[PDB]
Amino acid sequence: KATYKERAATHPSPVAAKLFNIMHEKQTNLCASLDVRTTKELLELVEALGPKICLLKTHVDILTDFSMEGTVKPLKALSAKYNFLLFENRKFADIGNTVKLQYSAGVYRIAEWADITNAHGVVGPGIVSGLKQAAEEVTKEPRGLLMLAELSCKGSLATGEYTKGTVDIAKSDKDFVIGFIAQRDMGGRDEGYDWLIMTPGVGRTVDDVVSTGSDIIIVGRGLFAKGRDAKVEGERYRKAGWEAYLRRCGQQ
Amino acid sequence: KATYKERAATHPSPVAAKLFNIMHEKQTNLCASLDVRTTKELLELVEALGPKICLLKTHVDILTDFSMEGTVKPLKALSAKYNFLLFENRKFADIGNTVKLQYSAGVYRIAEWADITNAHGVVGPGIVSGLKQAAEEVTKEPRGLLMLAELSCKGSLATGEYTKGTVDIAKSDKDFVIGFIAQRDMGGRDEGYDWLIMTPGVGLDDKGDALGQQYRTVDDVVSTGSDIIIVGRGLFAKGRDAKVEGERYRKAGWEAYLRR
């Protein structure tokens, strides 16, 4: 693969290019997944991890005190201050106005602040076209979508055929679909696609996933639970991910 | 398959038993899918369709004025008055506390009023066990779950293997998973399962109606194994009389069932 700096210069999606540049400049491919109960805990952790991450994965559906003024506003300020993007957990899985409104409206109004979101490909390309239209109608700011190509939960049905079907859906819009949540490389380079591979469940080891083609490591509890110091863990994982990245062979 | 009445008498799920009995007693296997923008129109249509349906599929996410007091309260009164269950559209697709709270809380608090909900199987059995525990914690009222085994949207990935996987997941809990949203019989009888097959995208092949002719007919799906026909805009859009359409679809649905 090309370096993050190089991919930032050629990628067709503005959000992807912005992400690749952040990764290059901050020497980090670390995404912090913070699934906490209160806005207070969330803001505290984001403050500590901000300098070490390229992306923050939020989980607004489990927050007990979510609000545009108390949560999104300070979150947007942090994103700006420390330079990292926002990725909301909500796994969209519908089409038409229903999915458009689940992404754009309601109390959460996700499309108004989340740079990146993800969707299940099972419902077909309609989820891609629907979310794309909703994003355009809500903001002029860059928005991108990841397809949930490979799940990690017990008994998941994201088989080889399902993943293949998901990759095919992704090919329908290289401008909006920037990549996948997956455990391995999804190819695509020979066809003119440059997909971001974000991999959760990392603690598999960093060296392992990065060596297999992961562009971003998604780490959750391993960064802040069990009395851990998030600042320290943020640096430990960033270093491990960056060094793993420097080691893998680039496209020459 | 045995008759709806017979299936109600031996079903392990109290929600499915209640639904099969409603179907027999009202002579209907019709589910009205109402995806309107306002509660006012919703309540008006439910009032007109009430006597003709066994199930109402709501779409709370598209409502522009949803409220527990103004929407759910009268909706429950209507289901009690006309005797039909509530099925909310929301296609759950996550696990753990995330899926539990998406189902139990928020502004919608779906588990508090929706007798039946549906979930995507792609995430695995965790979605079943999670929604099940949430239901038990939220209300004493029986709750049921449908797995989205066969989707009808363009380019869906509900292949033969995906569908089989979903059916295997449903087998993990015959008490809570009452059936599927599908386009054909999912079997299971020889294994001791009696799944409700609910099928959307149904029409009546009306003269000169190209749009409606794009859908499979009531006769086609019921003959194939569908237990409940899910009908949408065909019941109320383009100036149609909901009460008239409800009777037309109920009638065709039941006659096909008896023929079966």
From Swiss-Prot, chain A:
EC number(s) from the headed UniProt entry: 4.1.1.23
Database matches in InterPro entries: Aldolase_TIM, OMPdecase, OMPdecase_AS, OMPdeCOase_dom, RibuloseP-bd_barrel
Active site positions: K91
Annotated catalysed reactions: orotidine 5'-phosphate + H(+) = UMP + CO2
Origin superkingdom: Eukaryota
Impact reported for D94A: Reduces kcat over 100000-fold. Reduces substrate affinity 11-fold
Name of the protein: Orotidine 5'-phosphate decarboxylase
Organism, as annotated: Saccharomyces cerevisiae (strain ATCC 204508 / S288c)
